[PDB]
Structures are given as structure tokens and as C-alpha cells.
Amino acid sequence: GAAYHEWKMALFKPADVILDPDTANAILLVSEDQRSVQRAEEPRDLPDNPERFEWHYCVLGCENFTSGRHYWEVEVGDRKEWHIGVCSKNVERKKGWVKMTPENGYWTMGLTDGNKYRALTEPRTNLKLPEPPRKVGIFLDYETGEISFYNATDGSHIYTFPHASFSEPLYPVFRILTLEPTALTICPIP
Ligand SMILES: C/C(=C\COP(=O)(O)OP(=O)(O)O)CO
Numbered sequence: 001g002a003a004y005h006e007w008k009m010a011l012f013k014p015a016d017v018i019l020d021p022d023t024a025n026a027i028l029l030v031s032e033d034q035r036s037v038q039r040a041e042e043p044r045d046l047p048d049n050p051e052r053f054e055w056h057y058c059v060l061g062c063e064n065f066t067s068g069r070h071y072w073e074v075e076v077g078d079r080k081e082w083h084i085g086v087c088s089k090n091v092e093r094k095k096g097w098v099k100m101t102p103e104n105g106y107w108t109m110g111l112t113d114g115n116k117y118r119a120l121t122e123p124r125t126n127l128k129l130p131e132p133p134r135k136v137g138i139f140l141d142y143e144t145g146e147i148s149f150y151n152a153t154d155g156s157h158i159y160t161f162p163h164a165s166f167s168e169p170l171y172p173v174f175r176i177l178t179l180e181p182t183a184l185t186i187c188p189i190p
Contacts, residue, residue, distance in 0.1 A: 001154060001156050002154060002155030004155070004157075005137070005150050005152075005156075005157075006155060008071075008139060008150075009137070012069040012070055012071035012139055012140075012141070013068060013069060013070050013071065014070075014071055014189040015063075015070040015071060015172070015189075016072075016188065016189055017062075017063075017072045018034040018035065018061060018062050018063075018186070019031075019035065019036075019037055019059050019060070019062070019186070020059065020060050020061060020062040021059075022049055022051040022052060023051050023052060023053060023058070023059050023060040023093075024037065024058075024059035025043075025052065025053045025057045025058055025059065026044045026045075026046055026052070027039055027040055027043045027044075028040065028057060028058075028059055028176070029044070031183070035185060035186045035188065036183045036184060036186065037059050037174055037176065037184050038183040038184075039057065039176045039177070039178065039179050039180075050094075051093070052093065053093050054093060054094050054096075055093075055094075055095065055096045055098070056093075056098070056100065056175060057175055057176055057177050058087075058173055058174065058175045059173070060087070060171040060172065060173050060174075061171050061173075063171075064089055064169035064171045065086075065142055066142065066169045066170075067142050068141075068143075069139075069140065069141045070139075071137060071138065071139050071140070072137075072138055072172065072186065072187070073135050073136065073137050073152045073186075074136050074138070074174070074184060074185070074186060075134065075135050075184070075185040075186075075187055076110075076111070076134060076135065076136055076182075076184060077182045077185075078132075078134070079111075079176075079180060079184065080111065080113070080114040081111060081112050081113070081114075081176060081178040081180070082110045082174070082176050083100070083108045083109065083112075083120060083175040083176075084110055084136060084138065084173070084175070084184070085106065085109060085138060085147060085149070085172075085173060086107050086138070086147055086170040086171060086172055086173055087107070087108070087170065087171055087173040088105030088106075088166075088168040088169070088170060088171075089168050089169040089170070089171060090168050091105040091106065092104070100120050100175070101120060101121065101122040102121065102122075102161060102164065105168070106120060106173065107120075107161050107164065108120045108173060108175065109127070109149050109158065115132075117129055119159045121162075125159070127158065127159060129151070129156075130156075131151070131154065131156075133151040133152070133158070134153055135151075135152040135153050135187065136150070136151065136152055136158070137149065137150040137151075137152035138172070140170065142166055144163070145161075145163040145165055145166060146160065146161075146164075147160070147161045147164065148160040152187075
């Protein structure tokens with residue numbers, strides 16, 4: 001099952017994703033090396049910042065993409081809740097209750113309640129993975145509208161969104177809602 005995944009990684013360019021603290025919801029803590037994020041017990045008290053998510057428990061990478069083919073890997077470990085993918089630069093960061101859907105500028109999938117994998121389509125799409133991933137590969141092909149997710153350990157395909165037509169820069173995006181020991185960690189380029 002790994003053959004195509006290996007071929008795709010050799011084609012797509014490895015992205016060096018560093019988390020941007022100025023975007024992170026106040027309930028989130030970004031590590032000193034900007035490679036991991038954890039949910040805090042209580043929100044931090046920060047001054048006003050137009051980059052920050054006020055409602056979704058989200059953080060972005062520092063760099064966006066407007067063309068090309070890119071790949072990065074996220075260690076999710078045994079964390080029981082997480083959603084990851086990309087989002088448009090112009091998502092509404094200051095508006096309560098926006099649903100994270102492609103129409104609102106998010107292409108994300110992940111895990112909830114320990115064992116329920118979903119793609120964040122409208123309505124949400126339930127997934128069934130034969131094995132729980134510990135590392136997830138995200139593939140972005142801007143020109144073809146491809147945003148794909150793979151189990152990065154055994155190379156199995158997880159989900160690809162309906163072909164998109166991107167018109168805004170895209171950021172890696174990470175969401176965590178629950179308080180638990182395991183953080184979300186970006187794997188660096190070898
Ligand atoms: C409360 C919150 C996110 C949960 O949104 P939702 O409650 O709409 O559920 P989901 O289908 O997981 O997006 C803040 O990021």
C-alpha cells in the first residue's frame with residue numbers, strides 16, 4: 001500500500017511548517033520551537049491581534065501557499081481529538097459559530113471522541129480507517145485542487161476532498177478542542 005504514497009512524497013515538495021503564535025486561539029499553547037501545539041487549561045491573556053482566531057481553537061502555520069505541490073507530516077500519536085489540514089488566508093477569524101467546511105475556506109479531517117474519524121465536509125463525512133494513524137501526511141496540489149490525507153506510517157490513503165478551485169493563499173491549520181496529555185507535533189524535513 002505504501003508504493004503510491006512513496007511516489008507521491010518524491011514528487012510533492014516537503015514543506016517546513018512552523019506554527020504562528022499570533023494566530024493561535026488563546027486557549028492554545030505553541031511550543032518554543034514552534035513545532036507543537038497543546039491546549040491549555042485556561043486561556044492566556046493577550047492583547048488584541050487581528051491575526052488571532054477568536055472562536056475556533058485553531059492555529060496556523062507561518063507561511064501560506066499560492067501554487068505548487070507540497071507535503072507535510074503531523075504526529076498525532078494517541079491524542080483522542082484533533083483536526084488538521086489547510087484553510088484560506090481570508091477565513092473569518094473573528095466571527096462566532098462559523099462551520100469549518102470547504103465553503104467557509106477549510107479543508108480539514110481528523111479524530112473525535114477517541115475513535116470517530118471524519119472529513120469536515122458539509123455534512124461531515126464519516127471515515128473508517130482499518131488502523132488508527134499516528135502520523136498523518138497532508139498533500140496539497142494547488143493547481144489541481146488536491147488536498148489529500150494519508151496514514152504516513154503505512155502509506156494508506158485516508159481522504160481526498162472533492163476537487164477544489166483555490167483562489168486564496170492556503171495555510172496549514174490545526175485544531176484541538178480537548179485537554180489531554182499528547183500534543184500535536186509537526187515532523188521536520190529529514
Ligand atoms: C467548538 C469548536 C469547534 C467545533 O465545531 P462543531 O461543534 O461545529 O463540530 P465539528 O463538526 O467538529 O466542527 C471551536 O474550534
